[PDB]
Symmetry: D2
Subunit: 249 residues, 4 copies
């Protein structure tokens, strides 16, 4: 059984490597994400949530991810440098896995997103007229700095800052919310993730998980992909959710 250790800075890589060693696991260190990662039994992320997002941009089929939070808040991580040994041991031996859906939009067919797909204007300080449709029905048209289509996992990211609700990890759904909407009233919409999202806009740009982006004009489609992000089951995922959220910043 071999595993890949991905890291941003040399942080705690030494000890993490030795721990995987004592658990008799072959190790291969990575300076940065690479599609080569698909060829392992599981991955150990060392950094933050951003690290895990970058790792997932290289994966289609996804081996179990165990994340180590090196910073402040880690909604996607399993432990910190302080207790990764105990947890890693439990994860690597119990080998219970857990899945969360990933999305894709027609403008970038090969990209998958865990947090969200954002439609922003190309120039800063410029609005865009965005039309929104889901399962064919026109649900709204609004002028804003951009529009967010996020998963429940994304509810704590960009959507959160736009004023969105925090949604439980285990409740699948889309969160449609505008960024700086110019209208008297507006509300975030929470709909089923089985539905098809269509966003219509001119002189815009699509961004997925803040990584890959492509300029586009007209209309794009967003739906649930077939390749979820996979992690080892975090027994306290729900419990930690509320505490981690109050410390965001």
């Amino acid at each position: 059984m071999r595993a890949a250790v991905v890291y941003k800075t040399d942080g705690h890589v030494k000890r993490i490597e030795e721990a995987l060693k004592r658990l008799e696991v072959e190790v291969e260190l990575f300076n940065q994400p690479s599609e080569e990662l698909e060829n392992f039994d599981f991955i150990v992320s060392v950094g933050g949530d951003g690290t895990i997002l970058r790792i997932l941009q290289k994966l289609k089929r996804c081996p179990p991810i165990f994340g180590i939070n090196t910073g402040r808040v880690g909604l996607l991580t399993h432990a910190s440098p302080e207790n990764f040994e105990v947890e890693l041991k439990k994860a690597v031996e119990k080998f219970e896995v857990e899945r969360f859906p990933r999305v894709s939009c027609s403008a970038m067919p090969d990209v998958l997103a865990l947090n969200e797909i954002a439609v922003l204007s190309r120039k800063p300080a410029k609005m865009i007229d965005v039309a929104l449709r889901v399962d064919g029905v026109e649900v709204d048209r609004i002028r804003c700095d951009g529009f967010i289509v996020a998963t429940q996992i994304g509810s704590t990211g960009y959507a959160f800052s736009a004023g969105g609700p925090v949604v439980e990890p285990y409740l699948e759904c889309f969160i449609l919310i505008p960024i700086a909407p110019f209208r008297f009233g507006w509300k975030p919409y929470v709909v089923s993730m089985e539905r098809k999202i269509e966003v219509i806009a001119e002189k815009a740009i699509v961004v997925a998980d803040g990584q890959k982006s492509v300029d586009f004009d007209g209309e794009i489609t967003i739906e649930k992909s077939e390749f979820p992000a996979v992690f080892f089951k975090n027994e306290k995922r729900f419990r930690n959710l509320f505490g981690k959220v109050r410390s965001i910043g």
Copy 2:
């Protein structure tokens, strides 16, 4: 086949009779909701969403409800007097039904709520210290005027005014949100409606769908019941939601 027609004011009760008559349906009239409605094939509600809420408070087993919106906005209704005869026939003929979960708290053992269970302070202009727990884990503790535990159907009611998100009718869940929270940061939480909610508060009052209340001191649990609200299927429920919401007043 027999149907009970419940009305707020006897303004159209005649036309409706001469319509259920044409459809060969035995008809009975009730000026005020009653446990007897439980002995009919279906119920016709004349008035507003409130009318429907008042009817439900009398039903454990719930015959299919066909609502005729008397006024402005009716998220729970099926048509207005301007076209009820048409939509009524399609409903009675196809007889396709739809169900939405109802909840109950321990303070009032036999009452069901379609919108929410709200916990407010007994005296106006006075705060209460509220503690929240779902499935055992402590999720929050905050000072506020009150706290709402709503279903997705209630996401457009009291919860909406407290700044909650608009949630699709076909996505089951709990919107947990405070009313006038006295704290720098706060967010609504959307969790699976399969979980157990617990609200701990002193000098408080519990209200179900705005109909039945009762004072309580301490803990009360809220959870999904076995007796849903049953309505005739509304083929356009999803599309008409966004429109009706923007006109809420």
Copy 3:
């Protein structure tokens, strides 16, 4: 020179007496607010902002107030038990005074409010239809749990929880904001404090600084009074503002 010392609990009332001693000031201890306080050169509040709100309720003319916060946050206080001495001496010796307007409403002529005048429904969990006029012009009609009319000082109290903006102490103005407004869109309005505020509501109750209330039906008017609250000049009032607000709860 004699000064009154008001306290809720026996907290640090001792050392505070001994400090006013070394400053050659005559002391008079009060277990609770009294209209008597008007006959002093200055008052020393020992408790919190609530304590100061309760003291001001019994003062038409207001001798300089010096607050000591034994609580968590005190936007109206000058020091904590840890440094009241140094600050008390500076205040009493330099004796520089600062003033903030107080408001009064027609329903309760003799009452003055430093934070706000709030219009709430008599029964909890019930909305009230509120009409708002400023200087005779109609500004808004809305359904809500209540409606707040606050000063810049109250901007961090009830109005804050209703979603209002924090206004610095030295910018005189009114903050009009509803509690749980039942409407798609709504915004807090910030108008000049020289204007006449008019609130029309049935089955309501008016409250001033959360201390005095009167049931009322019809229309009440609110405007700037002639008896400001008077405190010793607080040099760091402004810079302290932003830190104290983030800790509110």
Copy 4:
């Protein structure tokens, strides 16, 4: 008495020309704003609030402005095509003036802003770390898509969409609010326009009234300038505000 008529389209230029001729006012046509407008007794704007903003960009000394609204909502406007002839005559005959402050940025020494000075990220979908100080005191530090420093006039513009409050036209003040702030809690701040604002951020751009922008790295300061925007007094500005704000989109 000579006046310049600035228009965005051939619209009602003809009828406006006869209207002024019929008033013994010498007129001149301008397709696009010019620094020459400073050489007229008054200016007639045809278009929307944007037209007015673009005209102000070329004026230090500001001759009175009369606005005719082509669009749907014009908070800076005076009349619509349907009745400009009437209002125009009352304006030009009474010649009553009204002034509103414009602020200036240190990154663009000669530009004036009526709505706001906004600091945004250079790249879309990228946050910037923004530090805020007013009158030399540290007020906040937050990660966001941007930050807005608006005047009461701008409170209905960008600040509005960022979730800021509605501040009446006659209450001079600054509105400090972030765009898509990534933090659990946050509040818009309203401070006196006599204070000095300082925004600190790297890899950012400053935009004035959404017209002129420059890249900056470090610290910029914003203060009230000496060159106000001037308009013919709008008798119903205060009452029309609430109506216009509720129709924004």
